[PDB]
C-alpha cells in the first residue's frame, strides 16, 4: 500500500552489495509490484555469496 523510492536505497554507499537479479536496479523506479517482501537476517561476511 505505498510508494517505494528505490533511488534512495540504491544511491546509499553503506551497501557492500546491491545485486538485482530478475530486474535491473534502474528499472525499480519504473516498475510496480503486487507484493514486496523484505527478508532480514545476519550472517558472516564470507557467506554473502
Amino acid at each position: 500500500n505505498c510508494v517505494a523510492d528505490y533511488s534512495v536505497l540504491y544511491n546509499s554507499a553503506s551497501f557492500s552489495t546491491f545485486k538485482c537479479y530478475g530486474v535491473s536496479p534502474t528499472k525499480l523506479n519504473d516498475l510496480c509490484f503486487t507484493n514486496v517482501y523484505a527478508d532480514s537476517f545476519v550472517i558472516r561476511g564470507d557467506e554473502v555469496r
Partner: protein, 50 residues
C-alpha cells in the same frame, strides 16, 4: 482452409511461448531489464520466433 487456419493460429500461439526467456512478452523484458542483460533474453525470443 482448415490447414491455412491451423498454420496462422499455431504461428500466433508460438508468441505465447518463452523459449526459456524470463517472459513470453518483449515489453516485459524491456520493462524489467537494462540493455546489457535484456539483449541476452531478447535473443532467446528472436531465436525462438525466427
Amino acid at each position: 482452409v482448415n490447414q491455412n487456419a491451423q498454420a496462422l493460429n499455431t504461428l500466433v500461439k508460438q508468441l505465447s511461448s518463452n523459449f526459456g526467456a524470463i517472459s513470453s512478452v518483449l515489453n516485459d523484458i524491456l520493462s524489467r531489464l537494462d540493455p546489457p542483460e535484456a539483449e541476452v533474453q531478447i535473443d532467446r525470443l528472436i531465436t525462438g520466433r525466427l
